[PDB]
Write a protein that binds this DNA or RNA. Structure first.
Lengths: 187, 149, 132
RNA sequence: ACCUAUACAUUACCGCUAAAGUAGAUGAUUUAUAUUACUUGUGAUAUAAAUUUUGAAACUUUAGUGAGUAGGAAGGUACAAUGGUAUGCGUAGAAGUGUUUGGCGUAAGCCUGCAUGGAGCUGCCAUUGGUACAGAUCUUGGUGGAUAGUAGCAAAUAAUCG
RNA sequence: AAGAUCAAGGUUAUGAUAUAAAUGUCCCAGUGGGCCACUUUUGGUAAGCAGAACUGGCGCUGUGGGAUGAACCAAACGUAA
RNA sequence: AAGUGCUGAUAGAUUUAUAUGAUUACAGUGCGUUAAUUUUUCGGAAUUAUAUAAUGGCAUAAUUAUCAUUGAUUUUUGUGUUUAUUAUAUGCACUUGUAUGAUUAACAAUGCGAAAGAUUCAGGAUACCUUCGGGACCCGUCUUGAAACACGGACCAAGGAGUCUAACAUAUGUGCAAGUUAUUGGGAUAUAAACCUAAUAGCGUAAUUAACUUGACUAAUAAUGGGAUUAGUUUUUUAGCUA
RNA sequence: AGAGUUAAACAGUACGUGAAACUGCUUAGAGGUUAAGCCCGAUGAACCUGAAUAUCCGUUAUGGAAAAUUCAUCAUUAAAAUUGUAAUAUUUAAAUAAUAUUAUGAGAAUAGUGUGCAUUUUUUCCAUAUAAGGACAUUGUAAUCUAUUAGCAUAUACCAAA
């Protein structure tokens, strides 16, 4: 009369990446061997960070790689990004580093290699630094996405700045009754 | 593409009521077709979620041909992306036979917009329409806006 | 005779009787092939005593006795000679079970090959025959 | 004192959840010994013997729990088609089908034997659906009990010898 | 008064616990006809009646028990010794 | 309250212990320290005779808490005396010794694999028959509740019902990514495919006001700034542990 | 009904194949306890399925019989590969690394010869042996283990009252 083995016992989190990708799982298999065998949390979270859905993995841009350099105690640093690395045109001066990433966009590979940096695969970062020495783990901006805006769509409670789900933006598209004090009510 | 083998409707055979509840059975148009009654039954659902639904914000513009107004925008965030990448580093040089004369108009953007903060390097921007603020930061960078066909 | 596959714990068949579907003995339209009673009136679904047994997982055989024929040999559907040759190393877990679509002339080869390999065949008397 | 629920205790076993390891094999590990180094006793090396080729998108290993309509998700099973494949099967008998053949799986269902048969057919990985029936006062065809005869085949007499 | 900078502090200042919890998305089904009992109660003489409050069941629940039984009692059911 | 000593019966006994994982620990017995007493009186066995540590019991002293002081009890510490008890100083060889965390087997009997052929034994709710007990009311359904004196359904076979499409939201995968989508069309063909792809256009890259309009400032940078909670890393400094 | 024909009339004009419902017959069995139908447990009948080997304290010791020749203890000869290393080219200029080509050294084996190619060895067979011819199956006893039930026999402590 089990008081109470109700819930939750199904939990939460992926053992293994939800991906057919034969490459991706080899990295997981590699870092999974490196986890308990060499202690240290860099192995523990990079294993997890490969599990990650495409959302929660949103593309890290090259100017974000260049602002991290301005950080104290960071000049000798091989920047880790478990992610797609995207080219930012606006950074005039791209600093030297070796950057280790899952994927680097071809325009981003040219501005790293011009710097003159190396674009590196995680398996060669694992060889270099199995102790994660002089890394820096960067995670992308998830707040950017159009989906995040829409959540919380509520009128009443003095909120939202949420974006109504609108196919077309203009006058005669949801400007009227309920957006403004004039046509009855303020949002 | 498609498998009905991945459909769960396949799985729901049989399950007698196929996920469509025994008591209240899914029967053709239970809530009235479409946006009906949006002043009545769905009033909760419209102001929630679409609120500006219904009335007017009237200024009826009979025969807006969207060629007069079209005006696409480039920001002063970006603006240096009109300059080809291997020339972009080439005019950071420092060498002056200058200043940087970018033809915004043939890059198809009618209007140069304000957005702010470019490098101190002087830019002349050849543009039809001006943000006064875009010009203000360009003039601070020591260039100009030369106003353009 | 033929030497049995790898020391099994005695195969508990645990419920033996074909589940038969509720009221197959009432109706020839209702096939003995099990179909679970979903329905609101079911005394079977509420598992009243004396309304048979619904396939519940706990009739489930030990994962060691899983597949074993009681002369040990698990069933491999053997289409021909090359197919037979797979179970040369795997005498002691598998038996060649000649598919019914196979002709006698090939069966004579399969049975002959099977004796060489010393892998059990479950059905030899398959298609034999005082016949051409 | 005794009796006794799927409760309760323990145990084997199913599943689901949990929790941990597993992924140096030109290598590792165990065992015995000869030699050598140090030391009492241990390691190195040589030799001989033995184990180890892991769906590492699983196994080994572990513990706690399971009513269940509506419903949701997860994983299979069957059916027709298609790309590929098994140098697949096949008139020496295919498919189909009857079947106290034998067996497998909790099941969905599978294979096989035997009989019948006569011309074509299937497994696996992906790929698409007019995809699985007991019902719908379902449809269409067939068939029972009623009933080899019960209603009846009786109004206008109704023949009959032959 | 807030933001708040700086320095001081033995033991973190009830008790059991955490089946890990919090958080977001789906705007998801299913539901919008309840029924019964302890207790508390209103209408009604009352009702297997109409209607609340709190809580549990039944609805979705057999099994053992009340001879019997949707609901009461005991108890929540993988398969067996 | 004492494993002081002890008997019966019941059910269970995964044992793939190298699939890719352990077999380790203890004990007995022998070995080579001695003596003395006792019992059997043969083989042996016990107890006593050391050092070390702990513990209880005696006496004494201090603290600290407490019942009240006649006297006790507590927590802590020290000291002296004697005695008992327990652990350490008990290694190596061998061992069918105990356990090694699901430790069923010593030991034995019987059937029997007896070539093909095929005896004999054990075991079974296959179909189905039999014999015994117990349980089993008709499904589907609406309904609070269905075995209902609720409704459909005599019986059986086969058709037979959550789809396709346009447009949409969310989850996810895939491609590329500050861009993307070629397939309107053209080039081409092994042909309604594949391969190539001019040019636009769509959406995104600025929004908001009705619209006119104007323009997110700061900085090359500041992932919005500052601030507070947050990971991960580098990093000052120190401690412990392991190598 | 015989017969002919046909590979088959188990294809003889509902004619390929051949279902279910349903019915007749035959075969088995029973029949007053719910009308009948049903599940489980025990149980009989028909019917079927499963069925193993070497050891006390070990299966090694020993003896005989046959056969082998790169290896057999190993040497030589030939054949090609592997381990490690280097070069020259390519890959990535260059490095490490990898790859193609080439070369060297360490070795191991496939064939040939050789003490022997049964001097002997080794390989392969057979017999005999210690409790015993055994462990598939079912059985006996006893020792244990886990859960448990039910006694036995031994001895105290304290409190009240006495």
């Amino acid at each position: 009369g089990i008081d109470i083995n109700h819930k939750y016992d199904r939990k939460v989190r992926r053992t293994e990446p939800k991906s057919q990708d034969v490459y991706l799982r080899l990295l997981v298999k590699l870092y999974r061997f490196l986890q308990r065998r060499t202690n240290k949390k860099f192995n523990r979270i990079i294993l997890k960070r490969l599990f990650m859905s495409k959302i929660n993995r949103p593309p890290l841009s090259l100017q974000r790689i260049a602002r991290f350099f301005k950080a104290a105690n960071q000049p000798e640093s091989t920047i880790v990004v478990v992610g797609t690395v995207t080219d930012d045109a606006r950074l005039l001066v791209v600093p030297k580093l070796t950057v280790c990433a899952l994927h680097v966009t071809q325009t981003a590979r040219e501005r790293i290699l011009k710097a003159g940096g190396e674009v590196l695969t995680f398996d060669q970062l694992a060889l270099r630094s199995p102790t994660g020495k002089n890394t820096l783990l960067l995670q992308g901006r998830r707040t950017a996405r159009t989906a995040c805006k829409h959540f919380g769509k509520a009128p009443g409670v003095p909120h939202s700045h949420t974006r109504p789900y609108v196919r077309s933006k203009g006058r005669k598209f949801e400007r009227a009754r309920g957006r403004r004090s004039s046509c009855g009510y303020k949002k | 593409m498609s498998n009905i083998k991945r459909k769960k409707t396949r799985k729901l055979r049989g399950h007698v009521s196929h996920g469509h509840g025994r008591i209240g059975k899914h029967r053709k148009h239970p809530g009235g077709r479409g946006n009906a009654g949006g002043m009545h039954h769905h009033r909760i659902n419209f102001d929630k979620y679409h609120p500006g639904y219904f009335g007017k914000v009237g200024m009826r513009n009979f025969h807006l041909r969207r060629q007069h107004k079209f005006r696409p925008e480039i920001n002063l965030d970006k603006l240096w992306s009109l300059v080809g990448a291997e020339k972009f580093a080439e005019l950071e040089k420092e060498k002056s036979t200058k200043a940087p004369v970018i033809d915004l108009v043939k890059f198809g953007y009618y209007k140069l917009l304000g957005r702010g903060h470019l490098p101190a390097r002087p830019v002349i921007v050849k543009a039809k329409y001006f943000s006064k603020k875009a010009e203000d930061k360009i003039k601070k960078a020591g260039g100009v806006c030369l106003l353009s066909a | 005779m033929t030497i049995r596959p790898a020391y099994r714990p005695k195969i508990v068949k645990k419920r033996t009787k074909h589940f038969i579907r509720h009221q197959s003995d009432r109706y020839a339209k209702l096939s003995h092939k099990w179909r679970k009673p979903k329905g609101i009136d079911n005394r079977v679904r509420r598992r009243f005593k004396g309304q048979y047994l619904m396939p519940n997982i706990g009739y489930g055989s030990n994962k060691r006795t899983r597949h074993m024929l009681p002369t040990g040999f698990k069933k491999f559907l053997v289409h021909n000679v090359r197919e037979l040759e797979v179970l040369l190393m795997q005498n002691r877990v598998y038996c060649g079970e000649i598919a019914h679509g196979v002709s006698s002339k090939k069966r004579k080869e399969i049975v002959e090959r099977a004796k060489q390999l010393s892998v059990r065949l479950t059905n030899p008397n398959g298609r034999l025959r005082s016949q051409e």
